[PDB]
Amino acid sequence: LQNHELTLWNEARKLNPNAIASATVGRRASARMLGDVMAVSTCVPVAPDNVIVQNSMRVSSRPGTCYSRPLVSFRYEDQGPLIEGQLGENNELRLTRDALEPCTVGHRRYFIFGGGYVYFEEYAYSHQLSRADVTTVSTFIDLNITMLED
Amino acid sequence: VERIKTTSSIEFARLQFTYNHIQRHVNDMLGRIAVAWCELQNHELTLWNEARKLNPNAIASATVGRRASARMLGDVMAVSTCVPVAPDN
């Protein structure tokens, strides 16, 4: 089974090397493909209380085009400066605001933030919510193995 | 001051030994199997997260249990039940 499932893994790392490297290596690392091998680098932890989310994903200077992910401001330490950026996948901070898409009506999006989700409605902040607020479907196959009693 | 009476059948103790041996091995191996199964599921969740981005409809139909249509809402899926249609129509 493992020797079989590797065939899937070799493809998944091409889709998202970040998640694959974080899952296999064991540390939350940033990875990119270097041909037929994957290069990784450790990511710096940041406390959840040092991040602020901006209300609007639209660009006041660019009409028609607007961010697909929320803008955020984070500080590495309490005496550090304010560093701007945009939210990524699975509690990821992006320094470059290069995630641009044409703005479309009926824009309702959920994004992972902290321990829960943040919901934006027509490219504007709507509200925070918890993980349990959204119904969950399980990808796990249950195997209930019990021991022999003495 | 008392005299201890000994039973004439040691077979109960031998049965205890055999049962303990078999039970201990079985519990060890099944425990390892259970732990490995858990790690395998946690490991496959990563592949599921990416296949969800690739093709939301099939992943939603597989996980939910009903043929539904799904579309990503950022970091989560929105699903809707699909209406059956008979093949002869």
Binding site: T135, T136, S138 | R71, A78, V79, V83, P84, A86
Partner: peptide, 20 residues
Amino acid sequence: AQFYVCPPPTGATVVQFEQP
């Protein structure tokens, strides 16, 4: 041997994956 027609998904119903 049965077909399904799927209306476009809406934000009314939202499901996520169970965490490890």
